[PDB]
Amino acid sequence: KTSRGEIIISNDGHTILKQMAILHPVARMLVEVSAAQDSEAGDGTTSV
Amino acid sequence: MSQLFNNSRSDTLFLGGEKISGDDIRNQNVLATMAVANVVKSSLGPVGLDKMLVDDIGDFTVTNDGATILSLLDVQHPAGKILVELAQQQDREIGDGTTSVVIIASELLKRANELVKNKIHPTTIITGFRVALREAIRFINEVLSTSVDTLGKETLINIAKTSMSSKIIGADSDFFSNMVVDALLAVKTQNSKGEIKYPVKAVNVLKAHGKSATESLLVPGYALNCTVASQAMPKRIAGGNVKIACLDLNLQKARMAMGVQINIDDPEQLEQIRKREAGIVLERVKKIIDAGAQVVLTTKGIDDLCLKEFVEAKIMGVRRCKKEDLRRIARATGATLVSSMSNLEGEETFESSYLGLCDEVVQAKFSDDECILIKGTSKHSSSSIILRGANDYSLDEMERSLHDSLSVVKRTLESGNVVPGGGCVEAALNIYLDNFATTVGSREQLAIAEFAAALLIIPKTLAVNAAKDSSELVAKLRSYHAASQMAKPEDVKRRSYRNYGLDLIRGKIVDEIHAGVLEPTISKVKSLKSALEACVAILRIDTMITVDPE
Amino acid sequence: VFMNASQERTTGRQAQISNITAAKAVADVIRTCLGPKAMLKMLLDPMGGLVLTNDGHAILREIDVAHPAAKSMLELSRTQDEEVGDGTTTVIILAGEILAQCAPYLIEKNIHPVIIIQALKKALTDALEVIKQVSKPVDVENDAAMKKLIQASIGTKYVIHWSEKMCELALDAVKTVRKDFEIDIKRYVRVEKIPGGDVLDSRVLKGVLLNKDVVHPKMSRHIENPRVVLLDCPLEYKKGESQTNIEIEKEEDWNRILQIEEEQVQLMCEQILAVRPTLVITEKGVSDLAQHYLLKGGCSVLRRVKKSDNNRIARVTGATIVNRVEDLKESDVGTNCGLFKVEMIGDEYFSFLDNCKESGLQKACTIMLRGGSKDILNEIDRNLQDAMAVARNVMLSPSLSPGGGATEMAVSVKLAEKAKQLEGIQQWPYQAVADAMECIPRTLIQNAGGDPIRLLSQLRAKHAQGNFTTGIDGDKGKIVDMVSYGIWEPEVIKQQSVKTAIESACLLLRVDDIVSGVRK
Amino acid sequence: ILIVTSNQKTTISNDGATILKLLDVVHPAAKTLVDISRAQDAEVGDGTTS
Amino acid sequence: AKQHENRLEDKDLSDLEELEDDEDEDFLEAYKIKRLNEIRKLQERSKFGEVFHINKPEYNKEVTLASQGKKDDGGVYVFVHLSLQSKLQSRILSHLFQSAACKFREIKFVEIPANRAIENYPESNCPTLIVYYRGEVIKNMITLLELGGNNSKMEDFEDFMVKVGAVAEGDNRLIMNRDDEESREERKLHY
Amino acid sequence: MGRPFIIVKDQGNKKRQHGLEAKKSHILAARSVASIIKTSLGPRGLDKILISPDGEITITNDGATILSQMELDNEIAKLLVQLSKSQDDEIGDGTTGVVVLASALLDQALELIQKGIHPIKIANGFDEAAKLAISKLEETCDDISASNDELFRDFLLRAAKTSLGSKIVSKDHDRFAEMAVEAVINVMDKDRKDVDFDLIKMQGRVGGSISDSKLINGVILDKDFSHPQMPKCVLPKEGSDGVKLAILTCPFEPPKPKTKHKLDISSVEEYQKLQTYEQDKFKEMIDDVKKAGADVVICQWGFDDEANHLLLQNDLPAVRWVGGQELEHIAISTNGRIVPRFQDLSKDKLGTCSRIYEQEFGTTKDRMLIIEQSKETKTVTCFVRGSNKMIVDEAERALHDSLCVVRNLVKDSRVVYGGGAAEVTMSLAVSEEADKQRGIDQYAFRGFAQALDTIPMTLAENSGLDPIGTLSTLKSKQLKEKISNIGVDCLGYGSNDMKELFVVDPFIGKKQQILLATQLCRMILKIDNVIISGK
Ligand SMILES: Nc1ncnc2c1ncn2[C@@H]1O[C@H](COP(=O)(O)OP(=O)(O)O)[C@@H](O)[C@H]1O
Ligand SMILES: Nc1ncnc2c1ncn2[C@@H]1O[C@H](COP(=O)(O)OP(=O)(O)O)[C@@H](O)[C@H]1O
Ligand SMILES: Nc1ncnc2c1ncn2[C@@H]1O[C@H](COP(=O)(O)OP(=O)(O)O)[C@@H](O)[C@H]1O
Ligand SMILES: Nc1ncnc2c1ncn2[C@@H]1O[C@H](COP(=O)(O)OP(=O)(O)O)[C@@H](O)[C@H]1O
Ligand SMILES: Nc1ncnc2c1ncn2[C@@H]1O[C@H](COP(=O)(O)OP(=O)(O)O)[C@@H](O)[C@H]1O
């Protein structure tokens, strides 16, 4: 459940990490790695 | 059922709401489903009773439909919004089984959560439902029955009584079943080179509280709710072959376009400019008056400058209206809806081919209301429904009830195959799936067995709404059905059982063919699939994450 | 938490108990507002006015109840008022009893709320049969019987003392609006009020009554044969639908622009004088320059008249609604106008338009009311709507049902006799329909001060043996037959009372739960 | 099961006899499980969880 | 409202007999049995009545155990006096103890020399008044400058006993409430 | 169902935890407690500052004293407070090691909790590994009971210097270790020896320096004489060198009964008679003491004034107000017994002392007596000094820990050699048995092996040596050679053999580190539901 009224189901680790607002910056770096795994390969965004 | 709220965790810091995991989520999702399932559980079937919901301004809505009662219940929980939008998807597509599909999904999430606690994975549970549903649709094809050796429109009458029931007008189903069937046969058309289709919301509904629901008059033709432009016009046009002119052109003191700024040096031009600016509209109305349009129809209103000639020429005027109702008037009367009058040549004109044809037109008074009743259309027939009741809230209940009744008979004529009702489908699919997967064995026998028990909630829900002994009927239903499925092909009597079951009025086992309980096959098709996808969406959820609003 | 609900869900049997108690409470407010000895009701609206009446519809308009089941009972009065116009209190008081009698069973003998509905439709079907048999026809052209038919409803109001004038007032008004099937409508019935004066000199006069006077003093205040012509546009100089924006260059242009403003109003006035009218009634306002030259021809100018009155003037004088003045002819000019005269009253001026009286369009009229105060006018005006409503039913339906509770009591006896032969599960709700139909005479006996125990016992003993027209005299409180009593009501009001009351019970009986505070 | 009451005194237990004694139960229907657990603890002393 | 309560609340067992002829018997005798029971409780609690000149070994019992009493939380107040004969305030406070001991028999009045009480106690801080109750020290009072000093009176000492919760405010034994018979005699005549 | 849903009171403050993530916070919470005291382990440790709510300050490195009197919120750390305390009360040593070893078992157990093994099955592996570890240490254990008292005297210094070496008292470890050993020589029976710990008192005065601390044989008093004109130092005369210390419960006062009583005084005849009664009582009093021949009299309560002067005349000093708990300890050292009353006073029940003196301490207005004994007596009292209040408390606690370490040597002579030698010896014993007994609990044996290695790696981390070379050398060397007294040298010596470095530890002390750790962690792992009611 995001901040606004939109609801979304997500099995993809990239979209899970993207919608989750993390306070810690080092844990936030994993959002960019999944974005990098999604942009380059497009498969195994949670395995990385 | 959840108590002792989850502790705020210091090792996992996420902005917004706190994260919670474990079995409490699927317990909370099922608990959110019971909050909406118990609401719709009581208003199921003829014996079922409905509730009221106020709008916080004095207004309220007494609702029988599952889509309407859930539309006003704005569910803040995420899992409940899936079932709320499913009913909005259900009523728009099929218009039937809106209460059952929510009740089926609630019972599935109940037993699915129990199976997850029994330590089988949800992926195996979902595979058990899909292989079971694929055999269920295969079994629905086996129990079809083609209408044959039926006198007249009896198959369309008695099947409408099933949809007409569970409402206030079920007692008057003997009177409304005829006009409902006659209404859809009046709006028949052709499309896609021979494929028979009927338009959505083609029949009108007019709210006229008054005499009674028994004396609802079926006007064989189109009806429109509009006030007369000028009260001096005649309210009854005599003589046949009344020409109807449908337009969407304004007849007022028209203004020039935005990018025109008049600038003149001569003072005397104001006389001609002021007259020509008004007189340019007279050229449009002088041509249609000479054409003999006895009753003109238009979307945009008509100012008093042009209402003089209609009063002098005895022409009926029409004020603002919806854009969609004039399309069907043109189709029935044979006219053509003109967005802007013009011609391919270099001069404006008005042809006679654009005029419609009807036998009679009259402004009938429904005890406070001006409504132009058109009857005896030439090109294509039409129909309208005059709803009557005690008060406006009952008329609103009669609107959506007829919309469900019209939708059921609409899909009935699309496919001649039908299926019986009254829990016989759910009772037969229960015993059929229990026999299935006995050869499979190892793991999916328990998942499909609980799936077969989930469909039995509908004959249990209908029984307790009657305030009678429920297990006495369940003992007769399942046992009779089983004795039919097991039987030799060659046994007339036993085979027949496959056909009948629960009765909610007299409380005994009687034949559905003589009783008249019947449903379409399309109502059950794609209903369990929607409930299946509804179960899959919540059952696969493990953890819940909430972000607070900014 | 979960969705905006579950505050306190009233579920099960207690929910229906509150609805029967709430539906009974609506009838208890206006229990004394029935019969000839009915008491009045002064309700205080929050804006600042006051409504003095005894009609159940006008009482329930001003009241406000914060309960959803009682509001459905509130809307039944609009069903009766906007269908006939009489018997609104009869609708509210009967339904209360129907919901109440069916309650014992719902609460105790556990008959499900659907079996009661099936029992009521057969009772509704039998109710129309006995109401059709008990009613006797009556001649529509008999003015002697029509006056007694109109004053049946007036007898339950304040103006029974002036009933000799109100029946003549209502009968002349209904025949004027009546079109030669026999469809009439009250939108042309003008409800204009005049505070003060005596009721005896108050009379209907054929035509209209304006609130305004002439503009110029030299206009003729007394015309023998007025010729009215209706105008929709104003006599002022029309600016036009688009901006003029005259680029003036020479000095002789601005005086020309102001001179054509004088000549355009001359051109529209001169073509009005082609037919030479005596009275020009404009919808919108009028200019000061145009009235003088209309007076040079002999017309009469008035202020802006709202088109609700001009449509009445079009049917009285026979003129048509005219906006374009260039297309003015001699055929569309109003004629056959009786007399023109202006009286002096301290409130405002009043211009009278009388008709010559000698098919075509239906004629309109204005009914003069000369009451004691403002509330007396509004009280008497609603009596005319209740009195003139009776005159429509006899023309649409020549049937005539007996009054004084004899019609509803006849429903009670036949449903009670036939309930024994209706053996089964439907017998208990079917027999309970007669228990409520015998209450509408019970309310008359309670207001009269008599004992309804022995009167109803004497009523049922004589109803089967004596005749079908027996009833209770509301003034004296004794059993008097309606034939000798000489008071009758239409049968259409009895149909709407039985239909609306039973159909209201079928809706409210299906209520299971009540959930408040969901959303807007 | 680790329970910590309002007085901030730690009490760890495995059997359901003293776990239900620590948690002061408001609901009467939930007190039925607490009464039989103390009764089973008082009479026999085994099977308080089962 | 208070006019009905003053008939019973503002009259002892000796004064309640005034209303025997005026008020109802059942209304009066019902309260006299209540007040009679309260008088019997004070007699049973009257375990003291003279100054207990103690010594230290005993302090660990007399001062503290007593303060527990029955340990029905039957607490007992114990007023200790660290006496010092060289000081003038100490001899004044010793006279107040014996005077209060004859009146308040339920409260224990304890006295001991200050030199024998605490090792090397400051002589300037004497006389010291301690009040024990259920083993806890309710008041560690300093020299009597708070209570007037050299001009301390019996009325000031009785007022201090009410502050620490040792005697009720409306007690008939206190000099503030114990009006003279001549005072009440003048009130009845002028009424 | 309604909107309220209540089962127990105060649901808002009570919050549960569950699942794998709930257990994850518990072990990681132990790392925060372990990491604080991880640097204080070994001889290179650093103390911790403590601050009470009342403002009193103290400094220390003992794990029980650190964790004690501390405000905590989590319940698992409170169990570690009770742990260290456990080892302290019974043993008095190893309070930091048992917490670090307990956290090491929890850290190695989390990896396994992450694979899918049940937590109770993990604890079963440590139990079989712990019993095999202690059984293997008992096999390679050396006993020192066969040696005589002379060599056994030296072994107390080897262990006393170990525990004192990890404190701030180690500036002179040879000097202060004799204080901890000489105190136990005076209480041991020399056959089936018992420590009798209650006789050994311990008191320290804030003043001077720590180097001036000297062991005495007697009782330390914190109070002055009844009159300051009495002589400070009191010696014996020609015969009977014992001063005949008479100890008394009842002070010099008038006799009277306990119960309330009023003595009725008649006319002047009785008034003059009672003046002779008390005047003859004091004459009878002083004759009774002189008949007994006492030279020093002490009572728990103060004598009367007149009584303070009457003793001063006959050269008979007196101390007054000697605490009741302190009065009993004086009679034991002096080989005397306390008389109930004065009529039973005789020669046999008097004391015996070598010499006494009133010691002054700077410009302060306080007096302390110091009793000394020339021969071996029963009890003994420590005399600790220091230049701060907390450093005396640290020296008292450091001496108390060494006093409890040598206490274990008396009741159990079987000792071990710690400092990373026992840990690596017990780690490879379970590792060699892991691949023999693969089963499913082999990972628990390996986790128990790696958990024991954290202690010598912590000593290597604090000493600055490389844990790679240190751990690899001990594992490679101990697998080759059977001699099991080589560990981590923290002081930087050239040889790691601990025969020459003079380090000895008890077997009961090193055993309890493994037992209390492995038995606690079973309880820590068995928690699933965690409810904490907010205060
Ligand atoms: N049918 C299967 N049977 C067994 N293992 C599978 C199957 N399909 C996928 N896997 C394994 O599960 C993993 C799924 O990764 P995936 O969820 O696709 O990552 P992402 O969703 O980030 O692309 C793969 O790495 C693969 O090794
Ligand atoms: N007269 C009847 N006899 C037996 N069963 C009926 C009858 N009318 C309706 N039902 C049953 O009630 C169920 C729900 O009907 P209804 O309430 O009209 O549809 P919805 O569930 O869309 O509201 C249907 O599945 C049907 O089998
Ligand atoms: N003079 C009368 N005597 C007895 N009953 C009367 C009399 N007049 C009216 N009633 C009864 O009162 C009922 C309502 O009549 P009326 O007062 O005209 O309508 P409303 O209830 O709308 O005011 C009728 O059903 C009729 O039976
Ligand atoms: N050695 C064993 N083998 C098999 N089952 C056992 C064994 N010991 C205990 N159980 C089972 O474990 C269950 C729970 O026992 P437990 O919880 O220890 O006792 P209680 O519930 O009285 O505290 C019992 O029902 C018993 O059947
Ligand atoms: N001089 C030394 N040489 C080798 N090892 C030592 C030396 N001093 C201490 N150690 C080791 O360091 C450990 C430190 O223990 P210590 O910190 O005194 O107990 P605690 O951890 O309870 O405070 C001892 O077990 C001992 O094996």
Ligand SMILES: [Mg+2]
């Ligand atoms: Mg339906």
Ligand SMILES: [Mg+2]
């Ligand atoms: Mg009326």
Ligand SMILES: [Mg+2]
């Ligand atoms: Mg057990």
Ligand SMILES: [Mg+2]
């Ligand atoms: Mg140590």
